[PDB]
């Protein structure tokens, strides 16, 4: 606006040279929106006048208050509460009558001047009542009097019994206690002024009284005719002195700026009760974390009960995000829990007002990008839109309990193509906000205002009638969509879609295991996974008869030593992502076992979270992307198929169960009883693991048929396999560090002396003997490996490079030391001959069925 | 000179030259008339440079005239036509907007893809920050379109009800009247899809590049990193983090470099990558290679070999510098690339291209413990699509790459590590993860990048690496072969008159190798050919009689010694300063 960049220029570039310090004595005139305080010269101060006049005649948004100090012109500040809400009349007749009581306590005062004088009084009124809430300025700008003197003419107003009569019959219900005692000190508000959540105070009457010291009997109160003549913030102003209408009677001596965006958040962040919190005093403030200016909101939030804003800790000076845990959802879903009506009309009076706005900025011509955005408004909580592979828009849509699932997305995001609830939402419910619009503007033809308001309000309400049956075309719904697909956009969704470990998508919700308990997540949350399984259907963890039969006949059949728990450790966190530990485990042993339970059940309760039905042909593909994908989006692997008798299967596993795209792990293996999953390595893998069950009175058919199809054994046995997990890891974080369990690596080594070749020769042949003195060297090593062979297993050729290098990579490098001559040779230890005795001083190279769980 | 040939594309530069530079002091440019018109040169920086500027040395005039240049190409354009606007001068309005924000070129099937530049106050990825970003639609432009442009909307309106309200006579009353009814008709269509969509269509045309996709990572001398732009053109770092005309694509999230600090991680890192091999004199041309990584291509043709140690840092290293680069420079190169016969004989598959634009290729998974090395080894580390290096080789501590080559590759470079309490896995385990270490040796690279800038520009010319070359012919050594009967029979003999012949040196080799070795058939082209081209080039010459002569040496038989007049063919600071 013109006027405004004219006042702007003003202040920036002239007036800028009077901007006083803080509290200085100076000041006159304060911009509480610039926060600026200045001291003006009277000439500076008019020219200030004729721009703020300009601005209020245009009805430009300012906050400039006068500084009263110790002699100016009297301001009367009345803050009535009234009978009803219906503006008072307040008539000249009732106005003169209160200027004469006004005077008669100024007249008594002893100040006034002798001789004849006029002086000017101006009522400027609250535009309408709040809640009963009304007020007027009396204003006496001419009149300059001591600070001393006003005091006192207040306190006798406060007690003045014609003037309560006044107000009372105008039905103020405080009229003992209506004039504010501090009017002589307040800064006083210029005309067309306002604190920034008021609107400014109206000039409705002004009164001329002529006082005559000579005639102290006559008192005529002229009433002001032609008002609008004059420069209003010029004459209305108490410390002008240069007025044209308004001329001196010398008597005897923080920053908000919202915008109104914010304003929505101050009114959802007042209704819930949380002014103390002792469980979520950081759950608001990181979720403001995306609101860049922060510092205003926190301090209008968390600074009142008191406790010092924490001493100002201010969260050790604005702490950053962990990560995307909260954004203005979280305040937005911390409403419709406590005060859902308020919230939804707070809602409903913004979602009017932005509409509002668009109807009456463009006036009948509503497009697309109008509807985008109120749509945005109305439903950004629920919907996202992302470019993931291919740059087609593709939809992310929250699923509420009050909707049609699939069968378990209950509180997830869910893939669209087209959404579908927002072509039904666009027509329904914004139509809601459509009639309301046509209601408001047809209220506002029932006003008694001239003829242009009248045939303007009527042509954009007959444009508005085309423009409100266009929200259920096809075409105008669909770019609407399209030209919202650029409002919801996340730029980041897909990106962090499945990437937290500690999350699960459940039938009942979301599963979190960040700490130890289970949460299940049974309400919004800003947590953005997608993919859900809908088997799982945690009923936390039980001690009922299912869960007690599961445990019964899953374990208690397979006999371990000292309660041994590793095994279905291993078998439990499946429902981690990644960044774990990287055992895998063969399980050669037993032919009807549970081997076909376990492993099978274990990977029905998951679903394309953590399940790949992986064949044998990626362990047995003789040379070596496009093969164990399903293996690296997801965190469990198994071979269940019984394929072969004896094939040898090498191929890239050397990299397959370690990590190094993503890391992953927990891969179970079980081909059959048959000797299948062997091939000679020398790697000394001690991250594979080989159990074998020693079960082959009854099979127990029905546990193998039909009661893994039961929903309900499905839900107890991941309620039993969440339980383990964090029964692990409070007690052994990580399988690595847990207790040793001699069944488990006595079968795993066995195993390996199975596989012949380097462990049997470094366990048989060799002794760890530190008393022996005799230093071997690699090839004498190699020669005792050829003749060994050649004389215990078969005879023949070796070239000696490779075993060279294979014993130099065995587990003997612990022996093999770095020597000041740089050799491999041996140190602290032995090799012993056929029929030799170690040496002395050499060394070799209950189950209850309740309360069946944790072990020392 | 930069502005100078930011507006030299102006036919009649001159005159602003003389405008702007003539100015306190000045005194005539001080007489050097654009140093007596100096030539002109390639596609340097352009009136962006200017464009920048401004806006935060003198933002408030700047935005003043910007603002009036924008509601002046605005006003003419509803002046000239009466009220109705259309996809055209909107794109223009648009391209006068942002012509310094986004870019549109066309890449490979005839579509037009829009780059944006990114600003720190922007929902990015992680660390496009300062550098340009693929949009499959441009979400910004539609979103500044409906929003910001309708604020100058609200300015032509503001402009035209003050000229309404003005006294004059009632033709222009009535003419302003219905330009004000026809600019309102046209003003609600900049929130129209169809509307929107015929705009960006329309600017397509007007924020072309046309060097954009071409020359967009080209430079070698540009990193993309967390905090910006990484320029090593200077001897210092320059990182670049404000606006700039580099128009580079991708980049790399963790690289963030502070310069070099000497904080706790970096200290730890620089005793952790070395102190554990005892090395000679401050042996450090290993991770000296593991430098100039940053680099793209047109480089040394060097490889190293780290196959040795079992439990060592092996794979940490090559890891964590895979780790500190992104898509910049990092190929996972399953090694059957270049090992397991030349798989289904297609060279046209990964290779090449999958180190397109790369500068780091490393080979860490394993066969089985040996297959093969040659393959294409040849073929891709000769220069000849484009060329790049930096593959290190470290797959396991049993020697797979071994099979015959005696092509005399002194471009090859053979190393172990000498050092394999516990283990200590936990440096390769959860240490690598950390972003302040990436941080930290990504500085140190930066820092070891300038060092090789400043003393040594090239490792060849280098101060002399005595373990890798020793480990090197080492591993000629593993080849041996004829490099073996060279360095053996073969001796350096110049006050010997004798001269060998061909077929001489050839069953000298065929002797030493019976005698040595094994027995199997020999054909003498073949290893006159195969000597020809060895350490031994150098004392072979052209006969008069059109044949090759081996002069100035000696051939040792059974039991033979050397003659005389023959010959044979730790700092007390750290480490990590002036050697």
């Excluded at chain 1, 485990?585 to 953590?610: E, P, S």
């Excluded at chain 1, 530190?770 to 230093?775: N, R």
């Amino acid at each position: 606006l013109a006027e405004v960049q004219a006042l702007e220029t003003l202040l920036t570039r002239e007036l800028s040279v009077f901007l006083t310090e803080p509290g200085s004595k100076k000041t006159n005139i304060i911009n509480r929106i610039t926060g600026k305080t200045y001291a003006l010269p009277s000439t500076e101060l008019l020219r200030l006048y004729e721009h703020l006049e300009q601005c209020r005649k245009q009805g430009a948004l300012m906050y400039f208050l006068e500084r009263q100090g110790t002699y100016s012109g009297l301001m009367l500040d009345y803050d009535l509460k009234l009978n009803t809400n219906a503006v008072p009349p307040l008539e000249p007749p009732a106005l003169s009558r209160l200027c004469h009581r006004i005077f008669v306590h100024i007249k008594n005062s002893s100040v006034l001047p002798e001789g004849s004088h006029k002086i000017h009084f101006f009522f400027t009124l609250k535009p309408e009542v709040v809640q009963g809430k009304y007020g007027f300025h009396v204003l006496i700008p001419g009149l300059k009097l001591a600070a001393s003197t006003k005091k006192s003419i207040i306190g006798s107003l406060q007690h003045d019994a014609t003037v309560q009569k006044i107000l009372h019959e105008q039905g103020v219900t405080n009229p003992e206690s209506c004039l504010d005692p501090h009017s002589a000190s307040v800064p006083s508000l210029l005309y067309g002024s306002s604190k920034l959540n008021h609107k400014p105070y109206q000039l409705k009457t002004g009164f001329e009284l002529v006082f005559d010291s000579s005639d102290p009997d006559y008192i005529p109160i002229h009433q002001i005719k032609n008002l609008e003549s004059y420069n209003l913030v010029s004459e209305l102003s108490l410390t002008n002195e240069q007025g044209s209408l308004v001329r001196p009677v010398y008597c005897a001596a923080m920053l908000h700026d919202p915008e109104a965006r914010y304003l929505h958040k101050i009114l959802n962040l007042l209704p819930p009760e949380y002014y103390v919190e002792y469980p979520l005093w950081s759950n608001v403030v990181f979720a403001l974390a995306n609101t860049s200016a922060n510092y205003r909101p926190l301090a209008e939030w968390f600074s009142q009960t008191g406790g010092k804003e924490k001493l100002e800790k201010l969260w050790n000076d604005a702490s950053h995000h962990t990560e995307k845990k909260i954004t203005k959802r979280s305040i937005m879903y911390w409403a419709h829990k406590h005060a859902p009506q308020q919230y939804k009309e707070i809602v409903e009076q913004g979602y009017f007002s932005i509409l509002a706005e668009y109807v009456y900025s463009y006036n009948g011509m509503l497009e697309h990008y109008m509807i985008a955005k109120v749509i945005y408004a109305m439903m950004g909580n629920k919907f996202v839109v992302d470019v993931d592979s291919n740059g087609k828009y593709v939809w992310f849509e929250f699923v509420l309990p009050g909707q049609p699932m699939n069968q378990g997305e209950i509180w997830k995001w869910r893939k669209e193509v087209n959404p579908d609830e927002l072509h039904i939402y666009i027509s329904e419910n914004f139509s809601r906000v459509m009639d309301r619009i046509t209601e408001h503007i047809k209220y506002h033809l029932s006003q008694p205002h001239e003829s242009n308001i009248l045939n303007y309000y009527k042509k954009l309400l007959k444009a508005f009638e085309r423009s409100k049956s266009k929200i259920f075309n096809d075409s105008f719904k669909k770019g609407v969509i399209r030209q919202a697909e650029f409002l919801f956009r996340q730029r980041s969704f897909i990106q962090t879609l499945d990437t937290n470990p500690h999350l699960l998508g459940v039938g009942n919700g979301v599963l979190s295991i960040e700490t130890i308990p289970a949460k299940l997540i049974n309400h919004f949350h800003e947590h953005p996974i997608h993919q859900y399984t809908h088997i799982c259907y945690v009923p936390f963890n039980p001690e009922n008869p299912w869960t007690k039969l599961l445990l019964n006949a899953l374990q208690d059949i397979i006999p371990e030593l000292d309660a041994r728990l590793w095994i279905m450790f291993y078998l439990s966190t499946a429902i981690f992502r990644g960044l774990k530990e990287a055992l895998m485990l063969l399980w050669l042993g037993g032919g009807c076992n549970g081997k076909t339970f376990l492993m099978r059940l274990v990977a029905m309760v998951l679903g394309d979270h953590y399940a790949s039905k992986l064949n044998i042909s990626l362990l047995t593909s003789c040379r070596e992307n496009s093969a164990f994908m399903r293996l690296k989006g997801r965190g469990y692997g198994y071979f269940e198929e019984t394929n072969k008798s004896e094939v040898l299967n090498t191929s890239r596993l050397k990299e397959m169960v370690n990590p190094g795209f993503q890391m992953t792990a927990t891969m179970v293996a079980a081909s059959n009883y048959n000797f299948i999953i062997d091939t000679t390595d020398h790697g000394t893998w001690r991250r594979l693991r080989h159990y074998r069950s020693k079960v082959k009175k009854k099979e127990d058919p029905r546990f193998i048929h039909e009661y893994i199809m039961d929903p309900d054994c499905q839900n107890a046995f991941f309620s039993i396999l969440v339980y383990f997990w964090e029964k692990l890891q409070k007690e052994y974080n990580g399988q690595i560090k847990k207790v040793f369990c001699p069944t488990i690596e006595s079968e795993t080594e066995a195993y390996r002396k199975s596989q012949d070749t380097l462990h049997r020769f470094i366990t048989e042949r060799v002794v760890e003997s530190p008393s022996a003195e005799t230093v071997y060297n690699l090839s004498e090593v190699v020669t005792a490996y050829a003749e060994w062979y050649n004389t215990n297993i078969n005879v023949k050729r070796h070239i000696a490079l490779e075993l060279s290098q294979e014993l130099e990579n065995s587990v003997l490098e612990k022996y093999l030391q770095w020597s000041p001559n740089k050799t491999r040779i041996l140190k602290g230890c032995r090799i012993l001959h056929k029929f030799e005795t170690l040496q002395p001083g050499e060394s070799y190279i209950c189950e209850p069925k309740n309360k069946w769980w944790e072990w020392s | 000179s930069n502005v100078v040939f930011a507006l030299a594309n102006t036919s009649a530069n001159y005159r602003p030259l003389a405008e702007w530079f003539s100015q306190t002091g000045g005194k005539e440019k001080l007489e050097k008339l654009w140093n007596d018109a100096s030539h002109h040169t390639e596609k340097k920086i352009t009136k962006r440079s200017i464009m920048y500027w401004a806006h935060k040395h003198a933002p408030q005039q700047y935005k003043e005239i910007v603002e009036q240049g924008y509601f002046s190409i605005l006003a003419e354009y509803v002046y000239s036509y009466n009220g109705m606007l259309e996809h055209y001068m909107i794109a223009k309005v648009i391209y006068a907007m942002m012509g310094n924000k986004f870019v549109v070129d066309v890449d490979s099937n005839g579509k037009y893809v829009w780059f944006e530049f990114v600003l720190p106050g922007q929902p990015m990825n992680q660390g496009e920050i300062w550098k340009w970003r693929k949009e499959v639609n441009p979400d910004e432009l539609h979103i500044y379109i409906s929003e910001n442009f309708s604020r100058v909307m609200d300015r032509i309106t503001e402009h035209i009800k003050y000229h309404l309200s003005q006294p004059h006579e009632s033709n222009i009353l009535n003419y302003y009247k219905k330009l004000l009814k026809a600019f309102e008709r046209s003003k609600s269509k900049i929130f129209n899809d169809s509307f929107k969509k015929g705009v960006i269509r329309q600017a397509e045309f007007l924020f072309r590049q046309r060097s954009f996709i071409q020359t967009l990572d080209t430079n070698p001398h540009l990193l993309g990193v967390g905090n910006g732009v990484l320029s090593i053109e200077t001897i210092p770092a320059k990182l670049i983090n404000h606006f700039h005309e580099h128009p580079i694509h991708q980049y790399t999230h963790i690289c963030y470099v502070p310069f070099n600090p000497e904080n706790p991680w970096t200290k730890l890192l620089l005793n952790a990558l070395q102190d554990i091999i005892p090395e000679l004199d401050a042996r450090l041309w290993i991770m000296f290679y593991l430098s100039t990584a940053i680099f793209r291509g047109l480089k040394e043709a060097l490889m190293l070999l780290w196959l040795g140690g079992g439990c060592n840092g092996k794979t940490f290293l090559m890891r964590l510098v895979a780790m500190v680069l992104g898509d910049h420079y990092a190929s996972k190169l399953n090694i059957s690339l270049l090992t397991s016969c030349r798989e289904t004989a297609e060279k046209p598959n990964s290779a090449f291209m999958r180190l397109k634009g790369r500068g780091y290729g490393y080979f860490e998974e394993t066969n089985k413990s040996e297959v093969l090395n040659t393959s294409r080894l040849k073929e891709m580390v000769n220069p000849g699509f484009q060329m790049t290096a930096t593959m290190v080789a470290a797959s396991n501590y049993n020697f797979i790459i071994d099979t015959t080559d005696h092509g005399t590759w002194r471009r090859l470079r053979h190393y172990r590590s000498k050092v394999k309490k516990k283990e200590d896995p936990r440096f390769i385990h959860e240490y690598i993860m950390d972003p302040d270490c990436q941080n930290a040796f990504f500085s140190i690279l930066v820092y070891f990048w300038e060092k090789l800038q400043k003393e040594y520009n090239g490792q060849i010319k280098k101060v002399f690496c005595p373990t890798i070359e020793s480990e090197t012919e080492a591993y000629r050594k593993s080849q041996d072969t004829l490099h073996r009967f060279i360095t053996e029979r073969v001796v350096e003999s110049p006050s010997a008159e004798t001269v060998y012949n061909l077929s001489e040196v050839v069953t000298a080799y065929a002797e030493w190798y019976n005698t040595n070795i094994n027995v199997k058939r020999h054909i003498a082209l073949e290893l006159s050919q195969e000597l020809e081209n060895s350490v031994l080039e150098k004392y072979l010459q052209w006969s008069p009689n059109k044949t090759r002569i081996l002069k100035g040496c000696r051939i040792l038989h059974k039991f033979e010694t050397l003659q005389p007049g023959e010959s044979y063919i730790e700092p007390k600071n750290k480490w990590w300063e002036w050697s």
